[PDB]
Amino acid sequence: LQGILTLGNKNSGFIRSLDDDKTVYYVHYSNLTGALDGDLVEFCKLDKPQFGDKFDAAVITILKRARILYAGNFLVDQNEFALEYKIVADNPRFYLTMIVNPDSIPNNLASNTKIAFQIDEYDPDNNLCKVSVQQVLGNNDDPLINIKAIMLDNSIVFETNDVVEQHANKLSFDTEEQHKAYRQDLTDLAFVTVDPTTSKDLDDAIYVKTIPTGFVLYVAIADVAHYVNRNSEIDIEAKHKTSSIYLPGHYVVPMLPEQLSNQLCSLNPAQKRYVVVCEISFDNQGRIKTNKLYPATIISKNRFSYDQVNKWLNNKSELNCDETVINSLKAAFTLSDLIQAQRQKRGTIDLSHKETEIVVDEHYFPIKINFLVHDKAETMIENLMVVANETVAWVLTNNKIALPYRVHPRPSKKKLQSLIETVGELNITKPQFNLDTVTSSQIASWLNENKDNPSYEIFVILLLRTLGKAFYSVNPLMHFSIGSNHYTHFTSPIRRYIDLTIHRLLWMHLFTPDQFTDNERDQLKQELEKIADTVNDTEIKIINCERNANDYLTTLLLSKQIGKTFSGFISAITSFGIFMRMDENNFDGLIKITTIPDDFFIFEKEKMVLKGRKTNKVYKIGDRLEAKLSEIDFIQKRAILTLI
Ligand SMILES: [Mg+2]
């Protein structure tokens, strides 16, 4: 009766009901009744029986639009002494015909200008709507303007909020805060930051000490919850954003304003800074012995890039820093290798695979695609952050404090079975573990014994699909790929709202509980599941925004390479053709089913293969192919390939 509409191929789609069973109904284009992708609708089941799989439905009314603003290109032409206005929506799932309100059009608005429009009225029987221009965004051919339009279409805020920046500018460094009894003075320790050269997120610093029995690790995290009070204007805006946004060209939309992100909560060299420390003692095998969490004061001694540290590692350079910093870094790498070995022993799934980035010029035009490489300095830093994240999750759990976990459930038996059959056709071994009971360690061993297989890349790709997305939950579910029964996000509160919330929980329950009421603690506890829901919903939008931006920029790059031949492998098979992942750029192009030579090919859904009816030739996931880039579909932002 009520559900969320999702539009797909050919702008038919399906409705996911709001009931407990979350039942799915198919809806054909002709039965949408003016509804758009993501809208909440009232729907009825069709009096037709069942073709198969699921029931069919029709939309009755729209209960709530997914969006109020839509991006599009504005066109103006004069025909017969009369101006004619047209909008071409950016989103190919926006299928309605638009009548542009002329009183919304500035006299100076030229053709090929990106705009945002709203729907003023619509006619569900004719798929016609009246729209008004609400924002003029800029030249429609400018790639940065298209990236900003994509954010708007995904409901992602990117304009600076001056009110919030003004509130943030009132905050300052209180010199007396370091003399509070609850705040440990750590200003003598040789903390350092290690980050990408371009990053302005400097909210974590590390120091590692050797003791005779092993190591002491200090992970110092900028004390953002100390600066951002719950339900302040800054907090509300951060909670709306949920996260910083990262797009190509190192374009960042920060979750928090500048006076926090670049000053008071930026652990800049030689500045006193207030932090929350996770201090963990290890034995000489990398096993955790003890831990403490506490507010502190530090002075970072150095700001390093991954590049500087890696070059120092392979003796291709040297670091101009104190000897205390050198020894901390050496112990950090030693400790990190030990921690890595212990986590592999207990069970953890290394899902590393090929990853790329798009290089753009100063005008945001894409230049080339780079493959990212394994880096020993990132691996060390990430290893230490993971152990802090897991430790904080256990400390909060041990103290019976409700929190948002970062969870990643074990995948179902049926999904594993499907995976095993697909990859078996590629000479990936048959695993011996029980599919009901499979542990993180057992998946790791399975991956390890196939590391030399030529199809290891599609193996990891398919495994990642099988595992699906991690998410946040207040219920204590495992994190199957990290390998822990309890895990959360604690080390990045400058750019993730969950980490900010975790910090608030520490303060209100462990650090200074006497300064808060039980109603404050219970008010936050009661809101945790809605915070998790909003962050989860917005994470889907952010991932979609990244996918949109990557498809836009990569097809823009590929539009200058028509006729080029690419080698690659089949990454997916659908009823409308073959997706081939190109070796040279890691991007999926579409080979349309109808145009495949030498036979008539039929989609077989159970194995997800195309089979030729006359020759029995099979296309399957993992197959190696060569294909010619024949066109760019700019409507759907797809690269179309033809087999050669
Ligand atoms: Mg960092």
Curated annotation (Swiss-Prot):
<dbReference type="GO" id="GO:0003723">
    <property type="term" value="F:RNA binding"/>
</dbReference>
<keyword id="KW-0269">Exonuclease</keyword>
<dbReference type="Pfam" id="PF00575">
    <property type="entry name" value="S1"/>
</dbReference>
<dbReference type="InterPro" id="IPR004476">
    <property type="entry name" value="RNase_II/RNase_R"/>
</dbReference>
<dbReference type="GO" id="GO:0005829">
    <property type="term" value="C:cytosol"/>
</dbReference>
<keyword id="KW-0540">Nuclease</keyword>
<keyword id="KW-0963">Cytoplasm</keyword>
<keyword id="KW-0694">RNA-binding</keyword>
<comment type="similarity">
    <text>Belongs to the RNR ribonuclease family. RNase R subfamily.</text>
</comment>
<dbReference type="InterPro" id="IPR011129">
    <property type="entry name" value="CSD"/>
</dbReference>
<dbReference type="InterPro" id="IPR011805">
    <property type="entry name" value="RNase_R"/>
</dbReference>
<dbReference type="InterPro" id="IPR001900">
    <property type="entry name" value="RNase_II/R"/>
</dbReference>
<keyword id="KW-0378">Hydrolase</keyword>
<feature type="domain" description="RNB">
    <location>
        <begin position="183"/>
        <end position="511"/>
    </location>
</feature>
<protein>
    <recommendedName>
        <fullName>Ribonuclease R</fullName>
        <ecNumber>3.1.13.1</ecNumber>
    </recommendedName>
</protein>
<dbReference type="Pfam" id="PF00773">
    <property type="entry name" value="RNB"/>
</dbReference>
<dbReference type="InterPro" id="IPR050180">
    <property type="entry name" value="RNR_Ribonuclease"/>
</dbReference>
<dbReference type="InterPro" id="IPR003029">
    <property type="entry name" value="S1_domain"/>
</dbReference>
<comment type="function">
    <text>3'-5' exoribonuclease that releases 5'-nucleoside monophosphates and is involved in maturation of structured RNAs.</text>
</comment>
<dbReference type="GO" id="GO:0008859">
    <property type="term" value="F:exoribonuclease II activity"/>
</dbReference>
<dbReference type="InterPro" id="IPR012340">
    <property type="entry name" value="NA-bd_OB-fold"/>
</dbReference>
<dbReference type="InterPro" id="IPR022966">
    <property type="entry name" value="RNase_II/R_CS"/>
</dbReference>
<feature type="domain" description="S1 motif">
    <location>
        <begin position="563"/>
        <end position="644"/>
    </location>
</feature>
<dbReference type="GO" id="GO:0006402">
    <property type="term" value="P:mRNA catabolic process"/>
</dbReference>
